[PDB]
Amino acid sequence: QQDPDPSQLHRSSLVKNLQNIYFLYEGDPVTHENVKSVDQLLSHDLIYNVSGPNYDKLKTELKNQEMATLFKDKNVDIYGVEYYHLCYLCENAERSACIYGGVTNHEGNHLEIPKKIVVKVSIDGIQSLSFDIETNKKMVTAQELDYKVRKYTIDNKQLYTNGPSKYETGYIKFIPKNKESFWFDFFPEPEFTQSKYLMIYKDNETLDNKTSQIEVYLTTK
Amino acid sequence: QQDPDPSQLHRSSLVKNLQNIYFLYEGDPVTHENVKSVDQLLSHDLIYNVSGPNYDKLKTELKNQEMATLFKDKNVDIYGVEYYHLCYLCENAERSACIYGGVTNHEGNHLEIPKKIVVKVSIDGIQSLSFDIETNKKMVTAQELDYKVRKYTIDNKQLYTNGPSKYETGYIKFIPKNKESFWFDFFPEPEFTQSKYLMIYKDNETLDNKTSQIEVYLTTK
Amino acid sequence: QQDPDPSQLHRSSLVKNLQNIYFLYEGDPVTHENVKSVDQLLSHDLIYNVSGPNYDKLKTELKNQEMATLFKDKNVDIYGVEYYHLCYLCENAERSACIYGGVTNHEGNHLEIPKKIVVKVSIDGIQSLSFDIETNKKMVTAQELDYKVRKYTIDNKQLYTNGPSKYETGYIKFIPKNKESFWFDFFPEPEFTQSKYLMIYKDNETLDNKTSQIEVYLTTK
Amino acid sequence: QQDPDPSQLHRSSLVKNLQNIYFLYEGDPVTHENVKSVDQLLSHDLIYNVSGPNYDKLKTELKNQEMATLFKDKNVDIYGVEYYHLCYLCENAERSACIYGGVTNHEGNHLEIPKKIVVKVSIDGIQSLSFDIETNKKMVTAQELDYKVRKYTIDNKQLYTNGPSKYETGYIKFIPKNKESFWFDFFPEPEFTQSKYLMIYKDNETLDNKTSQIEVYLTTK
């Protein structure tokens, strides 16, 4: 996957209920240090018995079968954007939550001092600014970063607002010291659902913090 | 309806996930002063475009077609226990919230000084204690009360808990100065869902605060 | 419950997607002789491991907890109208099928020769005609009948169609030789769901064939 | 996508409720000659006001926004596998029915005489046999075929059955005269749902019949 063309980017203005994206990145993420799955619905998703403000259970649809089973019996670290509307678990569970990927091993992956990272932002071609974000994981979830990144630009540069966004088009780009570059369109298809958009974290992509970079691009358009 | 029999009272011990009742009466209720429905799904429910922490829309299932259509063009005050698991609205609605009944006119039904009402608590026959609860409405949603009443006992006499309850059988009894008397088992069937239990507030029973009395009967068993 | 008033009746002209009612009574009902529940979802419903063209599982929401348990270990004869839109069973079960009540014991309740019952139809004050319906059960589900009855009038007097109905109002009245009389409105509220209408059979009302009578009242209007 | 490895194939023995696959392929597919979409839920799916025995409406999730929109205003021919458990449409549509892909232009793409295509079957390495399948389309959905192929083997070589499979591993492979080859795993992961599986049809892959070939590999294992 190479750098996107200006004709592939979803434009905010078009998206219907866009606020439903706001809440995703404005509200705190789900975080759980060292845990282990318990039940699982489909051979490609895992469940965890963790609690939170709005949940007493949690599922995470991973890339596929092979991946799911791999973390079935491993103490992991979860960091994901959850969604509620259209989330399923135990035939008997109200107070469910859902996420995709965001799962990374625990032992031998949690650092000493948080390796901050520089996120370069480009508004209309010109590099207006840059900021920092932290992490603990030597190997972090693509997701994690994106959030922390967005969360910021959402509280300081009003990326998403309970309503129209200040930017027409925006995408986040990752640069692993050795792998290919990739990106996520900050905006959904005109008509979307939380569940459907959040599949951008399903591949549960992971990359070394120490060696990866991050570039953001937006259009004041 | 007349006073129950100790064999018709649901017993807490039996109830599975009982906490799902807890969260209902522990967390803040749904309040909305003077509003008017907008769209409506079924001829017996109305929708209100209100806002809350976890919702931007709201549905309320009432007794039937008649009643619904009755409050459609009327400004009203809403006060009700909301559930989330199994709540529907607009095909394009994420962040939904529901409730049963809990609707009362607004104009000419709001007092000056909150009329305080005394509830007589009886633990195992003996009238252990009594407490107060307020309102504003001349004609109150049976619901409202029930809530306020449970909320208290819960935070003070540990009615419901995030887990097993201290009590086994308990029910609230209302007594209208000229109407019959009725009650609501404080405990759902062994296997229930929020949406199903809360239906007790469907008839949207209303009564005059000035003349009506309340009694609660619990069992330490 | 006494005979209705011409203002309490629903009007087929109002009903939106009326066809959804057609099908219900057009297509074959659900029949299963001598069986036993297996699993159960909510304290007040039972699941049967039976099959039909479009289902390998079947749930039946009964009146209350009490009633449910009562048939949990009894060989019964099911006979009822099923619906698929909005039916829940096993977290893993696709091809579900739900119905309300329609459960009657099996042993010592089935006859030799079917007792034909006469239904008196009335179109606009005048008793235009009457026909016969069969059954085997000494004690039958209020349901069973109503179907057989409707079914008929639909293939012969086109009660329901894939669209507008020839009639505007109509209801079926049952007359137990000793109990009270009661009825069902042939037309739902203007905006309904199969699930929500079919509950008229939840009480699982049963009556003796030998002694009961049926009368229908329609309007050409 | 090159030929799979014997470790990448899902094994029926494992698969849970497997029958659910049977049904999809045992009962008639969904066909519609020359039609046009009307409404649409997500920017990447379309809806058609078509009628079948179990549906008065039909949705079809395609590859993405672009594709959908492309076929939005065109007379198309639908050919595809429909699943019901978990199919969504209009907030007011019961009797829904979904499918992925299976959409192809209509005008100029339909033939005179059905070009029969030969499929090569290989049971345990040996090509025990081969058979023919028809079609009208100059360009066919990968789907159509896969179905007809399976449907066949299913009534003649007991591929699937209302239960365990006579085979353990099987996949259909397609071969374009100028494009890359690919395949579909005849079996779902151990725990699946119709919805999820049928997705292998989402890319709405299409290809010229006159030049394409079909192979099938299974194992009696």
UniProtKB/Swiss-Prot annotation, chains A, B, C, D:
Q: Which GO terms describe its molecular function?
A: toxin activity
**Biological process terms in GO annotation:** symbiont-mediated modulation of host virulence
Q: Supply the alphabetized keyword list.
A: Disulfide bond, Modulation of host virulence by virus, Signal, Toxin, Viral exotoxin, Virulence
Q: Matching Gene3D superfamilies, A to Z?
A: 2.40.50.110, 3.10.20.120
**Disulfide pairs?**
87-98
Presence of the UniProt keyword Signal in the record: yes
Per the UniProt record, one Pfam family is: Stap_Strp_tox_C
Gene Ontology CC annotation, any one = extracellular region
InterPro entries recorded? Enterotoxin, Staph/Strept_toxin_CS, Staph_tox_OB, SuperAg_toxin_C, Superantigen_bac, Toxin_b-grasp_Staph/Strep, Toxin_bac
UniProt record similarity statement: Belongs to the staphylococcal/streptococcal toxin family.
Other remarks? Answer: Binds to major histocompatibility complex class II beta chain.
What name does this protein carry?
Exotoxin type A
Could you tell me which species this protein originates from? Answer: Streptococcus pyogenes phage T12
Upper taxonomic lineage: Viruses, Duplodnaviria, Heunggongvirae, Uroviricota, Caudoviricetes
The gene behind this protein is: speA
